[PDB]
Amino acid sequence: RRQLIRQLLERDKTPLAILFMAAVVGTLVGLAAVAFDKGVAWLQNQRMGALVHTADNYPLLLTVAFLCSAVLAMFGYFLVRKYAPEAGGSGIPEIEGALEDQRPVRWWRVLPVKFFGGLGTLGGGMVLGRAGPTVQIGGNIGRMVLDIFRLKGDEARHTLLATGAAAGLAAAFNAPLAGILFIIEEMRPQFRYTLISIKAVFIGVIMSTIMYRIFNHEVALIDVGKLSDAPLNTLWLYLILGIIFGIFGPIFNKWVLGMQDLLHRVHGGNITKWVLMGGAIGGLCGLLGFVAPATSGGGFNLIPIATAGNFSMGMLVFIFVARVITTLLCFSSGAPGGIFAPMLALGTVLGTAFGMVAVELFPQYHLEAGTFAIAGMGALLAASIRAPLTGIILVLEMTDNYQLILPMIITGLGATLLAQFTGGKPLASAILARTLAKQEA
Template sequence: MQPKAQSSSLVRLFLAADKTPLGLLLLAALVGIIAGLFATGFQAGLHQILAWRVEGISHWAQWGLPRWILAVVVTAAMTALSLWMTFRFAPEAAGSGIPEIEGALDNLRPVRWWRVVPVKIFGGFLAQGGGQVLGREGPTVQLGGAAGKMVADIFKVNKDNAHALLAAGAAAGLSSAFNAPLAGVLFVIEEMRPQFRYGLISIKCVLIGTVVANIVCRSFLGQQATIEMPSYSAPALNTLALFLLLGCLFGAFGILFNRGVIWTQDWYARYHKGILNNRLKIGAAVGALVGLFTVYGPNLTGGGIEIIPGVTVGSFGVGMLLLLFIGRLITTLLCFASGAPGGIFAPMLALGTLFGMCFGTLSHSIFPSLDIQPGTFAIAGMGALFAATVRAPLTGIILVIEMTNNYLLILPLLITCLGATMVAQALGGKPLYGQLLARTLAAEAKAKAQAQQAQTEKEATAA
């Protein structure tokens, strides 16, 4: 057989072996387009809401009203309205939304995209536009998953293919939030591994959806890295033990952080007891506090991505880094546990950067003979806290590299994230999103049991 004929036969054989329907791959591309548009619109709208808020407060301050009072009132009102919209029309849109997608992939949660999409977008605008310490990545993952379910419903695909489109939308959402396509793919494969159905068709859909969504976002927002910072050289080999130590510290802190999230949610639940008015009171109080910080401590508010470049170039001393770390830890827990639509990725990345930079600066002072670049520890800290809390080390490593364009730091990132994951696992920690999903399912089962008991008692009384 001639080489050309043999080559043609191999191509035909490969195509014949590929059982993926072309229509499904086209639907995955459509999911990517919709998810990319959702993410782009959400980011652009959020920036506009933030600008309007600042301009409005500045305008009214010209009339003699104290700026801090205006900020407190406006942010409290925006937060309360966001919570009212969320828990009145789509409670599943509260918080990050990632546990909801994980539950949907496991056929434990419905995806009511027709109500989640508008509530997640406008509720997110109000909460995050007011300065809440929340990230946009959770909403974009849920919006991407909703896009996948929307396309599956409209085109009436079967259950297995709908699962693939849902996963493709979730990956596309994370990819679009951080301009990190590979991290989006890894997040679904690694973090959602108990729910994701591994197979050639599913993998293809995830890859296509992620690539298309990222192209859409880059078309509107540009191709630059999400976080602009210096490109660091590879650290000296004799400093790698310090990265392992940093990872171990983050492993222990990651467990405390996850427990802090759960404890804060429990604290809120004891007060609001599922009553909407009580939720709004809590939200208004948290919003008022955040509004005050937007005037007197702006670095304690917002998602946190915006402060990372300044931290890594040494704009803050050790004392200020610790204060910001503690302050943002408190505001992160208060804002996220309130149930306002928003993610926790970005706040965690900021916390990891602050502590990592503090560790790197102290290490540089203690070991002056070593060639230590404190900024490299800040970048390693970003991935380490993510790995310890979410328990997805590969996603954390690739996410940080893609966000910062620091590809030469892959070795210290591997060491730090591996150390954080192993320590967290050894100490009995559990992945954050898995815990949140389990709590949601348990709360709903309890509410259903109480409703059935009440109905039974009512019927017994009537009889």
């Protein structure tokens, strides 16, 4: 008690030094995120144009696509294996590690690797997001400033590493709330207190978001329009859908993990059979980007189209299966790139389909399939990485259908609920667990 009183009166006083530094961090992460984001676009572009000039005939071009993505894949798989192996896959597991002080931040290596790395895997049209990359790139930026300014302390090492990963997510999805929420719900050391300063993370998020806005305003990443509302007599349906995502979250967790192992064999850890295999997956993606594009790519492309109930039943299920596959390959293959976006895409597609069925089971509800899409869009994020608060808010800032806030809060929650009563676990933590264990062994 007597101590507490002493603390209360002392609460919320973050050293201006950390504060001013939080600003620069975000600013950097922002610009960087912008820079990443422009690069990827550029590469998807040339792949487009080089098919234009070789429009024929089937094969001349089914192949130039394959190569282009294969050749970009390999550049990426190589850049990781050779100079920064810890910059493979997501980036989140890693940085979560760093927040525990159970991994290091080799920023002078990771920056170039991930960035020019992802530039390749992303740009070549692989099933993988910007999120991992930029969240990772983000902490490293935050680290690089700690180093350059000889900042020392736990708080300061913890906070600056923290803000760059928030401001890295912020600038990735243009979601400044979800940026902050992620740190305080997931990223952070999960089992003990931490000296992360909220006030600082905000500032970073702000500044990187602004940077994103200075170069991407005048277009949302996802347009969905304002969907219909949701009658109270309609809510149980959102619980059901949550329950499905609740069983499937863990199952998809198994496969992501398992598929990592079953993919380690095809090179046994060997930099050459890896870069060549990744080169093959990459090639597969740049092919699919042209013969079935909904199955390949990041998949933001198909959220709008799914939400508008534009796919038939068949095309939805196909896309879902097809993506369950390609997502596994691209992520489990250790290639640098997040699984966050492609999960949004799975949740969306799943959502719609679930909707479609309800629409015709109950014309009395005047349902629109599209509201189940938006409920499900974050539901996978909720069942598999288990950080629902962050997914719910991620979709919120991203779709602006605030009136669906109950259905979305319910679907998400009923996913995190069955994902716990089927024994799944935070896929981000299952991955950090994997790393740390195959290390003291």
